[PDB]
């Protein structure tokens, strides 16, 4: 089948600025290659179809351009509403197949993270089990990394994050990370660590405790 | 206008079969075939398969070919798409579409069909408190939270001192692992601010008639 790589996977934009994209098929297409935005919760919308073709009803903010293997969707003068998702299609062969998406967000200036951490409270560990809880809150850029340590060691299984959108107000992201344990598991160990990198990082942010302080 | 329908969501268990279904209108049926796509959360779009709603014969990429069946009712103008044998990898996003004239490009989609595989039945959450380690109040800002785990299904309701403190909250996405929710929330105030006033989360979870009031209380 024909692949579709797509370019960059994450563009980081500001109202106002022209910006652009890029969808490379593995093999020629032609000009049969058709763009699609997404926005949060929504369903796709076509934008450009044959690589340059308007469709009625978008506005003329949005071109297509290219032939061949190389394809290019332009956003000249971008909004708010433009911050979503955007994915390539081609018809050339048979299967169409999809680009993995160039994702909108919106820029603004790096910021660290806020890192809490929180062991388990006694109402859960009185019903058996030990989730020790760390938020990471109000980072810029969205890229971050977690490792939860146990006496030092990296701990991998037991562990669930949830990420929230781009905040609507200041354009940060936040983090939940939750390492879940039995009670008895819980208790064979004295230090925990929620330890954090990011861009913003000089060293990695180490939030910790002892059971046995 | 033309009209994909389909409903918003099914649950399902694993290792069952569901058939989710995309009524067409606004044109005529046997005129297009219907085409079907799956969107993970997060990632991008994936085609399932089309179908000739006329003649009945199919279309099947690899990858799903036997995973997903597709059939029509002519008589209801109603695509069906069977998924067999589910896993967790399956919970996704189900689209029908319906291509332009030439069959090159997706001219219509329907709302999409959220597919949740799990085994769980009706079930309340356990609410804890989060409350900071003692000894470093730090300076400037305090940050507690709320962990609301093990319910299904969704949705649960959270909120800090019955709706009162909303700024500096941040409530994240519920996550599903061995079938069943787990969802927090952080609200950050000002270190002179708490514990001498009073912080409390609240939390509902409709389906199983749940509400909590759980005060933070320093540990």
């Known amino acids: 089948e024909l692949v579709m790589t797509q370019s960059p996977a994450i563009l980081s934009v500001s109202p106002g600025e022209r910006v652009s994209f890029s969808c490379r098929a593995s093999?020629?297409?032609?000009?049969?290659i058709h763009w699609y935005q997404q926005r949060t919760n929504g369903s796709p919308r076509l934008l450009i179809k044959?690589?340059?073709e308007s469709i009625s009803g978008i506005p003329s903010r949005f071109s297509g351009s290219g032939s061949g293997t190389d394809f290019t969707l332009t956003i000249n003068s971008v909004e708010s509403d433009d911050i979503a998702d955007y994915y390539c299609?081609?018809?050339?062969?048979?299967?169409?197949?999809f680009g993995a998406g160039t994702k909108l967000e919106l820029k603004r200036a790096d910021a660290a993270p806020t890192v809490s951490i929180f062991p388990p409270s006694s109402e859960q560990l009185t019903s058996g089990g030990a989730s020790v809880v760390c938020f990471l809150n109000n980072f810029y850029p969205k890229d971050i990394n977690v490792k939860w340590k146990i006496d030092g060691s990296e701990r991998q299984n037991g562990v669930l994050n949830s990420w929230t959108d781009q905040d609507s107000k200041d354009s940060t992201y936040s983090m939940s990370s939750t390492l879940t344990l039995t009670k008895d598991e819980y208790e064979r160990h004295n230090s925990y660590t929620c330890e954090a990198t990011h861009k913003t990082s000089t060293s990695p942010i180490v939030k910790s405790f002892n059971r046995a302080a | 206008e033309v009209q994909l329908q389909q409903f918003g969501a099914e649950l399902v268990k694993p290792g069952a079969s569901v058939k989710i279904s995309c009524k067409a209108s606004?044109?005529?049926?046997?005129?297009?075939?219907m085409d079907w796509v799956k969107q993970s959360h997060g990632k991008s779009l994936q085609w399932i398969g089309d179908?000739?709603?006329?003649?009945?014969?199919?279309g099947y990429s690899q990858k799903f070919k036997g995973k997903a069946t597709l059939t029509v009712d002519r008589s209801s103008s109603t695509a069906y798409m069977e998924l067999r044998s589910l896993t967790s990898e399956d919970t996704a996003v189900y689209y029908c579409?319906?291509?332009?004239?030439?069959?090159?490009?997706?001219?219509?989609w329907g709302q999409g069909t959220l597919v949740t595989v799990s085994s769980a039945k009706t079930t309340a959450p356990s609410v804890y408190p989060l409350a900071p380690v003692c000894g470093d109040t730090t300076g400037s800002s305090v940050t507690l939270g709320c962990l609301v785990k093990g319910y299904f299904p969704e949705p649960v309701t959270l909120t800090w001192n019955s709706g009162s403190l909303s700024s500096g909250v941040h409530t994240f996405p519920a996550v599903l692992q061995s079938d069943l929710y787990t969802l927090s929330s952080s609200v950050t105030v000002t270190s002179s601010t708490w514990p001498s006033q009073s912080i409390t989360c609240n939390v509902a979870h409709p389906a199983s008639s749940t509400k909590v009031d759980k005060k933070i209380e320093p540990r």
């Open positions: 579409a319906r291509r332009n004239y030439d069959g090159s490009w997706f001219a219509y």
């Open positions: 606004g044109y005529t049926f046997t005129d297009y075939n």
């Open positions: 179908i000739s709603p006329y003649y009945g014969s199919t």
């Open positions: 093999q020629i297409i032609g000009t049969s």
């Open positions: 044959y690589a340059s």
């Open positions: 299609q081609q018809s050339n062969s048979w299967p169409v197949t």
